Amino acid sequence: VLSEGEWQLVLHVWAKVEADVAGHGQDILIRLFKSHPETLEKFDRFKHLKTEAEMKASEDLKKHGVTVLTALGAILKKKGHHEAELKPLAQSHATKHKIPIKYLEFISEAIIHVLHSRHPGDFGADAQGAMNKALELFRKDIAAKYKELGYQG
Numbered sequence: 001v002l003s004e005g006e007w008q009l010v011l012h013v014w015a016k017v018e019a020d021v022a023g024h025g026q027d028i029l030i031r032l033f034k035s036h037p038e039t040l041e042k043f044d045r046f047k048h049l050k051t052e053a054e055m056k057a058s059e060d061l062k063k064h065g066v067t068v069l070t071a072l073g074a075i076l077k078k079k080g081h082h083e084a085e086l087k088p089l090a091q092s093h094a095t096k097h098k099i100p101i102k103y104l105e106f107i108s109e110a111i112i113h114v115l116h117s118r119h120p121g122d123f124g125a126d127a128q129g130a131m132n133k134a135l136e137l138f139r140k141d142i143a144a145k146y147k148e149l150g151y152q153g
């Protein structure tokens with residue numbers, strides 16, 4: 001369980017993300033695909049993209065980045081009370097997309113790395129720790145739902 005102080009560190013860096021969610025989403029997805037190429041293969045929509053330049057130029061990829069970060073943002077704003085938000089996400093990612101917990105760990109790493117690079121003013125050691133804790137809680141609860149839904153993850 002995160003403290004209120006920890007949630008505020010999470011929300012204060014997220015306030016900067018929301019200055020330009022599209023730009024942040026591009027950076028995170030590109031980092032994910034570059035650092036772990038196998039994750040791109042899960043996207044039948046995007047696996048044709050060969051280079052970072054093509055990824056950067058993809059309006060469709062930008063749109064999805066916005067969708068992902070807005071969904072995550074809505075979860076973080078619930079400060080742990082995210083049961084309703086997590087249900088449809090868990091089901092689609094378990095049953096349709098088939099996304100292992102390992103891959104959710106990869107995107108968490110991508111999120112942390114981008115926030116660290118972009119936002120040293122609001123992503124110092126305490127803030128990064130709080131964001132890690134929040135993303136760990138996300139993955140923990142998703143993993144629990146995965147098993148309920150009949151997916152190993």
Ligand code: HEM
Pocket residue numbers: 039040042043044045067068069071072088089092093097099103104107
């Ligand atoms: C930060 C954690 C993530 C969040 C909040 C998130 C959110 C979403 C949302 C809101 C959608 C659209 C509705 C839906 O299908 O549920 C979606 C679709 C999708 N997600 Fe995720 N996602 C996350 C991580 C991942 C990862 C790491 C992968 C693969 C490695 C992945 C694979 C996909 C795929 C393949 C789709 C369908 C794309 C399409 O063809 O339209 N997701 N995601």
Ligand SMILES: [Xe]
Pocket residue numbers: 024025026028029064065068069
């Ligand atoms: Xe993203």
Ligand SMILES: [Xe]
Pocket residue numbers: 089090093142
């Ligand atoms: Xe997810």
Ligand SMILES: [Xe]
Pocket residue numbers: 104105107108135138139
């Ligand atoms: Xe996550």
Ligand SMILES: [Xe]
Pocket residue numbers: 075076080082134135137138
């Ligand atoms: Xe979370």
